[PDB]
Short mmCIF file of N, CA, C and O (backbone and C1' of nucleotides) and ligand atoms in Angstrom, two decimals:
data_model
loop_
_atom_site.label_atom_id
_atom_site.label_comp_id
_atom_site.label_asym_id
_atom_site.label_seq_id
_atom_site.Cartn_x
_atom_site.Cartn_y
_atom_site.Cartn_z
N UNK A 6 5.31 302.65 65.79
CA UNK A 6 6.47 303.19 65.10
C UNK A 6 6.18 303.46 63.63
O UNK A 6 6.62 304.42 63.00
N UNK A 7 5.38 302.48 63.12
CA UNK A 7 4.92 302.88 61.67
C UNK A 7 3.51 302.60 61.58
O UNK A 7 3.00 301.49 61.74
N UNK A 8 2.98 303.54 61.35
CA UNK A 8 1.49 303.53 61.73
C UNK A 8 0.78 303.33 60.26
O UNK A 8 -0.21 302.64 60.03
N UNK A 9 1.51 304.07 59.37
CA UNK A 9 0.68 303.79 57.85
C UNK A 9 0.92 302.75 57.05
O UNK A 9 1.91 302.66 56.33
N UNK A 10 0.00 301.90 57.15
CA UNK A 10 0.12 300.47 56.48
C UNK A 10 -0.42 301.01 55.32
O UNK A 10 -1.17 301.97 55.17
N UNK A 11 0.18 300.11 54.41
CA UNK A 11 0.04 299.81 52.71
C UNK A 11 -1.66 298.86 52.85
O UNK A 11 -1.77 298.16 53.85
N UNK A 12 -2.62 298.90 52.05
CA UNK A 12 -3.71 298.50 52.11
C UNK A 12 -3.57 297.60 50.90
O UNK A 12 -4.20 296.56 51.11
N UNK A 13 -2.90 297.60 49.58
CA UNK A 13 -2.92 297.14 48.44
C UNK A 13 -2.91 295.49 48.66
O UNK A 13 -2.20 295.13 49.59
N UNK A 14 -3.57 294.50 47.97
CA UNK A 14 -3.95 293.55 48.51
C UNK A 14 -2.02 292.54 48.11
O UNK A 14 -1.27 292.62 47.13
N UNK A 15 -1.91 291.65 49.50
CA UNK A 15 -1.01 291.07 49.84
C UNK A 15 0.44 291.85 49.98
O UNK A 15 1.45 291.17 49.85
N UNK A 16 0.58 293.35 50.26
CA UNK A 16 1.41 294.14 50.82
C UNK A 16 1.50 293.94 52.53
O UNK A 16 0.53 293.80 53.27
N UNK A 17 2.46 293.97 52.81
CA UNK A 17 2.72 293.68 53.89
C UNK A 17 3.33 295.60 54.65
O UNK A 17 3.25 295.97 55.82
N UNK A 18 3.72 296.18 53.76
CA UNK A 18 4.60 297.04 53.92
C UNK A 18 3.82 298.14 54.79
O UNK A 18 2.61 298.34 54.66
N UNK A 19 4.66 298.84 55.69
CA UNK A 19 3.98 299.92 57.15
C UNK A 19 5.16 301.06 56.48
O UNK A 19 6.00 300.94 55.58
N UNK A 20 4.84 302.00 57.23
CA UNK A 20 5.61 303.28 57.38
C UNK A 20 5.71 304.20 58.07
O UNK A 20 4.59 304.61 58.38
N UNK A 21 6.66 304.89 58.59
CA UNK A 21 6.43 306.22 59.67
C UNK A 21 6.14 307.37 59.45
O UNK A 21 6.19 308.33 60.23
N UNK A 22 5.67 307.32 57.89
CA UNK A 22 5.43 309.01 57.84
C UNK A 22 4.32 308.55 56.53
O UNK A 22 4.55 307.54 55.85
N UNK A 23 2.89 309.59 56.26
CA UNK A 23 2.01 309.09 55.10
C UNK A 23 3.01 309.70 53.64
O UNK A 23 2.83 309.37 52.47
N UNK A 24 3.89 310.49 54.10
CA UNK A 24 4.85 310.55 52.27
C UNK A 24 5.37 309.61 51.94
O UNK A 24 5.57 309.44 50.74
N UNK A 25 5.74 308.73 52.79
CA UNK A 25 6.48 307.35 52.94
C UNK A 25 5.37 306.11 51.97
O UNK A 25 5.71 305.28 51.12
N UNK A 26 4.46 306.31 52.34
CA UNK A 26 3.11 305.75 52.08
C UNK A 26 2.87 306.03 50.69
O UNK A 26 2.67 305.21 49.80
N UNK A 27 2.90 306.91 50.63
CA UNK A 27 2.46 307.68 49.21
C UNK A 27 3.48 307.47 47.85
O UNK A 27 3.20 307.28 46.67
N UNK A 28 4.74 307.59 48.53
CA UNK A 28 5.85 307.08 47.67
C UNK A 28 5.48 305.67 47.01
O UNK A 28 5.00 305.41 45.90
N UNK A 29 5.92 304.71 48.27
CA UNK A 29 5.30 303.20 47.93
C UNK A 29 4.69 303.31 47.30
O UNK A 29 4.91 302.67 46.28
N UNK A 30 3.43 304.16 47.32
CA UNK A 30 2.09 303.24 46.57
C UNK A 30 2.49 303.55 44.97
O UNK A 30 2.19 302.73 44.11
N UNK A 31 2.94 304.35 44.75
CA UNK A 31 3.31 304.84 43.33
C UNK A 31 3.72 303.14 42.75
O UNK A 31 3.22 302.80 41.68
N UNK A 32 4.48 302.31 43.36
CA UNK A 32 5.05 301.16 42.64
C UNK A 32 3.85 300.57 42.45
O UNK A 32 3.64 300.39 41.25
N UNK A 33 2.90 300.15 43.24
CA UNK A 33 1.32 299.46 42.83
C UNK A 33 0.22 300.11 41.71
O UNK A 33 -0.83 299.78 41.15
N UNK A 34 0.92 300.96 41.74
CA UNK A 34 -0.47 302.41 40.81
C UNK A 34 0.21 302.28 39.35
O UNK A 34 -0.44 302.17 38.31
N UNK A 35 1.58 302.31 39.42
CA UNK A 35 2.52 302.26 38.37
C UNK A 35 2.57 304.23 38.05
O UNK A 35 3.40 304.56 37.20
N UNK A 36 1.99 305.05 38.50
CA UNK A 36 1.81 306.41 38.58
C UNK A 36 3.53 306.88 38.72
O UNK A 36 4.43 306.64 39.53
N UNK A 37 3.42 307.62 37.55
CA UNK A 37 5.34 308.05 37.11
C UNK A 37 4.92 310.01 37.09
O UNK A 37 4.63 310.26 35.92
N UNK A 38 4.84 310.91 37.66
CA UNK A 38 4.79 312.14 37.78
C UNK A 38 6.23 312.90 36.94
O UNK A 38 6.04 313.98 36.37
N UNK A 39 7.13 312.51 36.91
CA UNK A 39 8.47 313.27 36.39
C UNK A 39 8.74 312.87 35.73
O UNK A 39 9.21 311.78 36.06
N UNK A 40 8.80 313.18 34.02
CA UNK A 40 9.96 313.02 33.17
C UNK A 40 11.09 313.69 32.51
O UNK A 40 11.16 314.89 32.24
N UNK A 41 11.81 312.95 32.33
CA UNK A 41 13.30 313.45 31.84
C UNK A 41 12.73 314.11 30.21
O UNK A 41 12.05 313.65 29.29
N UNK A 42 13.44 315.47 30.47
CA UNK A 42 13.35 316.18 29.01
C UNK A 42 14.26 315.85 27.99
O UNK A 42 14.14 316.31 26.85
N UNK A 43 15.15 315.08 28.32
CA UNK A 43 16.52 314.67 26.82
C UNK A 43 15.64 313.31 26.17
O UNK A 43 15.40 313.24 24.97
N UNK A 44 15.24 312.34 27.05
CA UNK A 44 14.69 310.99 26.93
C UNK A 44 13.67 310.62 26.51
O UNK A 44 13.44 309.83 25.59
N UNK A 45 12.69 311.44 27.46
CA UNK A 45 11.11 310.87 27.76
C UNK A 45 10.96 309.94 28.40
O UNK A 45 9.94 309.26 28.57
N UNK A 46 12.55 309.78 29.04
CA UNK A 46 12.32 308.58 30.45
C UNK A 46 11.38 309.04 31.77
O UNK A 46 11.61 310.23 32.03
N UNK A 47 10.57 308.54 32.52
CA UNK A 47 9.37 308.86 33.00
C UNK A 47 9.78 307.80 34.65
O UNK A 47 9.90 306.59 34.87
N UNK A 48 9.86 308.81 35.32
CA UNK A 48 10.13 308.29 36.89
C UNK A 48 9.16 308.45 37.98
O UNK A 48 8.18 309.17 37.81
N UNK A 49 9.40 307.67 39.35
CA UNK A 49 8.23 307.85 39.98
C UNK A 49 8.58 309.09 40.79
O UNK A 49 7.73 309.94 41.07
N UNK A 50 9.43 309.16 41.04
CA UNK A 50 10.50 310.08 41.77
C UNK A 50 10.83 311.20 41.38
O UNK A 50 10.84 311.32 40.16
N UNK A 51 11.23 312.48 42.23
CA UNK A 51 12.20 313.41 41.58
C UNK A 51 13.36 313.40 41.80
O UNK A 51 14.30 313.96 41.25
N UNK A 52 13.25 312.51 42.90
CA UNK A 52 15.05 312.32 42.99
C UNK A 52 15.87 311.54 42.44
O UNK A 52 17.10 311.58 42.55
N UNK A 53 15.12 310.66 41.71
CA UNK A 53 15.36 310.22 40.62
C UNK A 53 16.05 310.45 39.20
O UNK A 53 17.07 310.13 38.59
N UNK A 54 14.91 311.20 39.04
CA UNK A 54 15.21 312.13 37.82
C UNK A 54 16.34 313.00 38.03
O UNK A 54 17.25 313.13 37.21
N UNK A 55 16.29 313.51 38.95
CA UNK A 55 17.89 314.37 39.26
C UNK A 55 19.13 313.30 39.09
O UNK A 55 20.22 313.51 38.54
N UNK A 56 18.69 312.19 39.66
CA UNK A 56 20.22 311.71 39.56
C UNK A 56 20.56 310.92 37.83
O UNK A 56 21.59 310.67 37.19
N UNK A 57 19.19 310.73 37.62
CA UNK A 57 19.47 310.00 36.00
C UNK A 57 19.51 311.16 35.34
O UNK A 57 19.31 310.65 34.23
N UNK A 58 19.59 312.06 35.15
CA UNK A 58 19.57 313.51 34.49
C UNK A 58 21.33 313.52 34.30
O UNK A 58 21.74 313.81 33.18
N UNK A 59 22.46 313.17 35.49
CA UNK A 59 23.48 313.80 34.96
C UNK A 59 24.15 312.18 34.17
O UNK A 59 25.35 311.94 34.04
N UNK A 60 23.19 311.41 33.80
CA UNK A 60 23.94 310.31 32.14
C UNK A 60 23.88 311.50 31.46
O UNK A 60 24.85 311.73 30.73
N UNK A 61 23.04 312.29 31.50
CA UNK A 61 22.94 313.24 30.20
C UNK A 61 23.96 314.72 30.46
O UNK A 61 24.42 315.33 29.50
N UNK A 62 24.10 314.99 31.37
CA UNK A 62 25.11 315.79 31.39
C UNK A 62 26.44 315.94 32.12
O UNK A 62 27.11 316.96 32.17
N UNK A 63 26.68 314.84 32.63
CA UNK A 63 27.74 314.47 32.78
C UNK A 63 28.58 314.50 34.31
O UNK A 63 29.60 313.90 34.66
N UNK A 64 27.44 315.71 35.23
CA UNK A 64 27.63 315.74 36.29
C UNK A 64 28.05 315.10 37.16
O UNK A 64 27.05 314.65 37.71
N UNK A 65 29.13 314.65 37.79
CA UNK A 65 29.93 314.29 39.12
C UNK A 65 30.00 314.47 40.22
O UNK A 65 31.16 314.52 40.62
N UNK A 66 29.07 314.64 41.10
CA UNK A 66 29.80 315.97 42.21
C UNK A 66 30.50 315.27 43.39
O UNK A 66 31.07 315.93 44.26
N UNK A 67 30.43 313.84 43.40
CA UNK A 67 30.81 313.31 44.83
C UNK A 67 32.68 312.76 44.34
O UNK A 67 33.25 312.01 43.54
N UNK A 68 32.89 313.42 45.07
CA UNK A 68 34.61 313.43 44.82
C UNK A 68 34.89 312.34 45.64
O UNK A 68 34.18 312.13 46.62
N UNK A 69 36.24 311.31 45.26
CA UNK A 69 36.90 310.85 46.20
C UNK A 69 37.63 311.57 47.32
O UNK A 69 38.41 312.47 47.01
N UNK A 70 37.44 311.24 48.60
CA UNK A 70 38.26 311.98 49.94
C UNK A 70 40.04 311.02 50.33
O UNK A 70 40.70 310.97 51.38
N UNK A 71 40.26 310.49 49.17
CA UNK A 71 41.98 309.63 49.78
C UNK A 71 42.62 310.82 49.05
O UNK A 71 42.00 311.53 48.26
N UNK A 72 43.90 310.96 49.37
CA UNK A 72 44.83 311.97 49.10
C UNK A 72 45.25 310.93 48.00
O UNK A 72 45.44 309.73 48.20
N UNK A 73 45.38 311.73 46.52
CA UNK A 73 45.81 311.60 45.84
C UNK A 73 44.96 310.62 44.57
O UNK A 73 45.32 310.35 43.42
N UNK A 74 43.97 310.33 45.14
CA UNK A 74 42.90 309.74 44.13
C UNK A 74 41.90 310.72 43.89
O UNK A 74 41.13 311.23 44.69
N UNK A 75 42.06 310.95 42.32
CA UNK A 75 41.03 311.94 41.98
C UNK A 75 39.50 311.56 40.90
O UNK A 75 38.67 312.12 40.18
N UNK A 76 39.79 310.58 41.30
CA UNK A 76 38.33 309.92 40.99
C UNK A 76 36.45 310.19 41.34
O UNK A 76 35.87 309.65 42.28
N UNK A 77 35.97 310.91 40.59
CA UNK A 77 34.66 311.36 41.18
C UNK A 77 33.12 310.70 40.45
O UNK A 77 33.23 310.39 39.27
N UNK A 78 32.09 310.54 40.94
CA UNK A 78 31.02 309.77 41.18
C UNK A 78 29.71 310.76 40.64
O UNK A 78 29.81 311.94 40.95
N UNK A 79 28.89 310.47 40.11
CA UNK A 79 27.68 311.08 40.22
C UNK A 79 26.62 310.76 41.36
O UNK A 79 25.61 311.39 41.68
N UNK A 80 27.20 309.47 41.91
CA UNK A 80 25.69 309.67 42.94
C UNK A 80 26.61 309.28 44.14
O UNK A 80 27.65 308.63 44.02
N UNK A 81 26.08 309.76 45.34
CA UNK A 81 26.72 309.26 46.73
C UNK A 81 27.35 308.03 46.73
O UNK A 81 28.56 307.83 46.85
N UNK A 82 25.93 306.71 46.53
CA UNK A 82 26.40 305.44 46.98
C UNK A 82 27.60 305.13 46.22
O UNK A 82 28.47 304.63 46.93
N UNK A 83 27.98 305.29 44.80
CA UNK A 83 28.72 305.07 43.88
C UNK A 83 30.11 305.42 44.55
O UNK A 83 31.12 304.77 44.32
N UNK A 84 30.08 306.56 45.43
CA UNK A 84 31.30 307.06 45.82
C UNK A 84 31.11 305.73 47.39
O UNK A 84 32.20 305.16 47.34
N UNK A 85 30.71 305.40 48.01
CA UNK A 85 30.31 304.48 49.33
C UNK A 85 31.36 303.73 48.48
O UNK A 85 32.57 303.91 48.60
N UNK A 86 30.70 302.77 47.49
CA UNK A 86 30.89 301.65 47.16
C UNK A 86 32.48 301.99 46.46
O UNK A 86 32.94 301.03 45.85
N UNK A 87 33.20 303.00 46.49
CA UNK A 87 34.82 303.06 45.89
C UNK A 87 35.50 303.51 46.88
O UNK A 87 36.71 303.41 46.67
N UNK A 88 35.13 304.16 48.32
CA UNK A 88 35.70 304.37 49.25
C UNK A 88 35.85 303.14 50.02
O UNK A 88 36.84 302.83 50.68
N UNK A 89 34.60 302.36 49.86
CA UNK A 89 34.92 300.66 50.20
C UNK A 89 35.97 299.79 49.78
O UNK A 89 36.49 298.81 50.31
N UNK A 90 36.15 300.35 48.80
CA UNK A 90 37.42 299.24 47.88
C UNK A 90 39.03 299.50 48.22
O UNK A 90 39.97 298.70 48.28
N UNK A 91 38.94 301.37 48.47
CA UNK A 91 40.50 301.80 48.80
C UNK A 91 40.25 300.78 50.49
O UNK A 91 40.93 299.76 50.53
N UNK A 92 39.67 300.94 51.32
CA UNK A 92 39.95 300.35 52.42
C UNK A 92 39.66 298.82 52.31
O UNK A 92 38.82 298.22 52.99
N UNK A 93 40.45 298.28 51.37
CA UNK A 93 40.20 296.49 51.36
C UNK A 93 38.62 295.98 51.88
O UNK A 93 38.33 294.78 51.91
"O5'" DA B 1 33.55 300.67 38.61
"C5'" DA B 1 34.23 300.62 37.37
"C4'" DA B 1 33.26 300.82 36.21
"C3'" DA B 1 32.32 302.01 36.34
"O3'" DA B 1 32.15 302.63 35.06
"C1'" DA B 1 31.05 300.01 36.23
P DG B 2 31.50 304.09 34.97
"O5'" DG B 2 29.92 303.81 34.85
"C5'" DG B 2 29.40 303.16 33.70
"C4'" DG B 2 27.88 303.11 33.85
"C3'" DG B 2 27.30 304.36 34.52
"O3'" DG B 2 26.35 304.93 33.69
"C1'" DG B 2 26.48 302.40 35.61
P DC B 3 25.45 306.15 34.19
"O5'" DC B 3 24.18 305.44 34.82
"C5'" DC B 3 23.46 304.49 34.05
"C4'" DC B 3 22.37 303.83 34.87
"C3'" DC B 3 21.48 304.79 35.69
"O3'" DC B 3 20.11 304.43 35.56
"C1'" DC B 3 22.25 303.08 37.04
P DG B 4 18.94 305.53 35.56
"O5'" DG B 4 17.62 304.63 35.69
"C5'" DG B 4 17.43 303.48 34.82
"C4'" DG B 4 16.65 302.38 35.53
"C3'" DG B 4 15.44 302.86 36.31
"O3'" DG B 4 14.39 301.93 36.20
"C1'" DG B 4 16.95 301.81 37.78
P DT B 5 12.93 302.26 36.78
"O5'" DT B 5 13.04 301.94 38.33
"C5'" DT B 5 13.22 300.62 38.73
"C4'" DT B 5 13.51 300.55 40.20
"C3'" DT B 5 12.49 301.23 41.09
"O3'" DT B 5 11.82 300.24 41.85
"C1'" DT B 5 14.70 301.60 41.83
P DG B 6 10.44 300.59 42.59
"O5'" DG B 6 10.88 300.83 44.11
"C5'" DG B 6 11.35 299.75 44.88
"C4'" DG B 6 12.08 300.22 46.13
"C3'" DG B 6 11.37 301.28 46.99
"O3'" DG B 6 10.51 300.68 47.92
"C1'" DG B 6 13.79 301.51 46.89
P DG B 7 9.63 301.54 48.97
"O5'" DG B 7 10.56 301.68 50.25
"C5'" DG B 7 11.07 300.50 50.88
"C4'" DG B 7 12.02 300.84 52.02
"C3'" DG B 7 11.43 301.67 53.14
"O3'" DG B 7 11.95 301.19 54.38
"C1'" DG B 7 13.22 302.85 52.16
P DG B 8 11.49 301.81 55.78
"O5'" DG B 8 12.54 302.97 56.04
"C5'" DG B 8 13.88 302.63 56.39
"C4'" DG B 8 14.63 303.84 56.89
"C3'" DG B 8 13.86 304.70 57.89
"O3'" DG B 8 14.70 305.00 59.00
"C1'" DG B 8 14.60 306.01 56.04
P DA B 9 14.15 305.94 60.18
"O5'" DA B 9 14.54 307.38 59.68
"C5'" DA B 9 15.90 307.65 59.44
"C4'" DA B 9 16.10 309.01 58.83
"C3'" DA B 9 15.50 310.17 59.63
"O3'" DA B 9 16.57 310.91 60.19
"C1'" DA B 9 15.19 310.40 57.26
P DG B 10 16.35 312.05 61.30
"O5'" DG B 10 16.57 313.41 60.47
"C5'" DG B 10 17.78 313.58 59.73
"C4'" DG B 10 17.81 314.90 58.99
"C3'" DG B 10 17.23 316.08 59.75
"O3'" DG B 10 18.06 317.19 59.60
"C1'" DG B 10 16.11 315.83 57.67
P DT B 11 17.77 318.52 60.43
"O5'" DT B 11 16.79 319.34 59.49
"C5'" DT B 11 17.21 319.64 58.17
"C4'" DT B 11 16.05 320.23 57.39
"C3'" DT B 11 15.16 321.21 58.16
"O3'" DT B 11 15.55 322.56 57.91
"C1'" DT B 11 13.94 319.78 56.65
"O5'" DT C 1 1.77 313.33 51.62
"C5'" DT C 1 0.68 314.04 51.00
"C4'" DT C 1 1.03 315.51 50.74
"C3'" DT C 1 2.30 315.73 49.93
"O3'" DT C 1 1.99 315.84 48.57
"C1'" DT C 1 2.30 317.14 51.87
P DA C 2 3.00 315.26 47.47
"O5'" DA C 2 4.20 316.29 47.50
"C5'" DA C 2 3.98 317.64 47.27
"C4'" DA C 2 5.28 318.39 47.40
"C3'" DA C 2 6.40 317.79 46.59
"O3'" DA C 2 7.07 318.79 45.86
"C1'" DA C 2 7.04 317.93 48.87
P DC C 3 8.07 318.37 44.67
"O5'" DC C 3 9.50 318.68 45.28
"C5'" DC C 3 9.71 319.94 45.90
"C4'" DC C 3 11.02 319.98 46.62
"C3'" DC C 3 12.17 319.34 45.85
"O3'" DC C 3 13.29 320.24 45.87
"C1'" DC C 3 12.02 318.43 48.03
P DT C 4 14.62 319.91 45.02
"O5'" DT C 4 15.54 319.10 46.06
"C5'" DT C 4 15.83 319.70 47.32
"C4'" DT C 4 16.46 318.70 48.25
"C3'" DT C 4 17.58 317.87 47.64
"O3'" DT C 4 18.83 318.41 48.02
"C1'" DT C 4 16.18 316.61 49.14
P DC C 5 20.21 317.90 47.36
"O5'" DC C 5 20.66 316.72 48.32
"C5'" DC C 5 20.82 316.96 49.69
"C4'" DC C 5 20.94 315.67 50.46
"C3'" DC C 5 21.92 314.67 49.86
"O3'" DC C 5 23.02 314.51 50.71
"C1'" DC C 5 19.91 313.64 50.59
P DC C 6 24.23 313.56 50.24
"O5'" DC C 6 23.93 312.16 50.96
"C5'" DC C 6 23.83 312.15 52.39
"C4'" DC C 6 23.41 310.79 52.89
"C3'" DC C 6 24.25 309.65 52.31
"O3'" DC C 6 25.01 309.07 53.30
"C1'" DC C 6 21.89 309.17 52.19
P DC C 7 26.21 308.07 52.93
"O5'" DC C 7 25.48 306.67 52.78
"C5'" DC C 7 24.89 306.14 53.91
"C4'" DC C 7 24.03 304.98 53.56
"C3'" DC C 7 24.76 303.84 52.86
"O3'" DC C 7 24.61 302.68 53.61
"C1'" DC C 7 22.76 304.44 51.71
P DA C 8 25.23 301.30 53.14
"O5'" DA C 8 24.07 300.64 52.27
"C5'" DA C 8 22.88 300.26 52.88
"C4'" DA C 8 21.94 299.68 51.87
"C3'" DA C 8 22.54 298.54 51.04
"O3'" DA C 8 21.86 297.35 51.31
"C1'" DA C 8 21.35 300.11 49.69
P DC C 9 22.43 295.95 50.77
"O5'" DC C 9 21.42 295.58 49.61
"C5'" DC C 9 20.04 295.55 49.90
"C4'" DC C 9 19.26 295.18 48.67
"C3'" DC C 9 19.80 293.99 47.90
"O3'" DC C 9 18.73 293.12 47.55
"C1'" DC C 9 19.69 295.88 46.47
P DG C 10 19.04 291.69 46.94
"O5'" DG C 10 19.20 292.01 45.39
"C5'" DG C 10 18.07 292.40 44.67
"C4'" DG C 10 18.46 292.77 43.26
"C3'" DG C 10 19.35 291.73 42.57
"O3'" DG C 10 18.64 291.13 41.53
"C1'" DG C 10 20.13 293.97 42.23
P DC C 11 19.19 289.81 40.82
"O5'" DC C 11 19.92 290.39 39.54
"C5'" DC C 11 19.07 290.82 38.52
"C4'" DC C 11 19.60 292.03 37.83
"C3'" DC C 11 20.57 291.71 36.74
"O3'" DC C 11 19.89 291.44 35.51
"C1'" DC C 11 21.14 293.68 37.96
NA1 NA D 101 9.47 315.60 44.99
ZN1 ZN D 102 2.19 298.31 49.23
ZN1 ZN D 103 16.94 311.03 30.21
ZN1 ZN D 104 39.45 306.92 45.30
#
DNA sequence: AGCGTGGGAGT
DNA sequence: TACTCCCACGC
């Protein structure tokens, strides 16, 4: 099921795909490819950088779905974690 | 709350 | 491979 094991010494960690692999290893390498142009904050990720990009501009896009709460989120989970709260 | 950081997955 | 999106841990 996950065929690409992490080799880095005392990693335990497998994966199902080698991008999966490749991601990981970035945390052992410390290897940061993307940085933010307002900052010079420096990520391993690009999806990253997309989502720390809208501190700087302010972007929202994940709306609350309850009628009548108009409360909106910049990143998915943020909206998870407030749709959790209207339902006790 | 706000967000760095992470795996699992669709494409 | 890379880009992208989701949900999640932990502060
Ligand atoms: Na990418
Ligand atoms: Zn590893
Ligand atoms: Zn920045
Ligand atoms: Zn709401």
């Amino acid at each position: 099921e996950k065929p690409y094991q992490c080799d880095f010494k005392d990693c335990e960690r497998r994966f199902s795909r080698s991008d999966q692999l490749k991601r990981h290893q970035r945390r052992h390498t410390g290897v940061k490819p993307f940085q933010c142009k307002t900052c010079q904050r420096k990520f391993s990720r690009s999806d990253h950088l997309k989502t720390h990009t809208r501190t700087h501009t302010g972007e929202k896009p994940f709306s609350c779905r309850w009628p009548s709460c108009q409360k909106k989120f910049a990143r998915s989970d943020e909206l998870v974690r407030h749709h959790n709260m209207h339902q006790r």
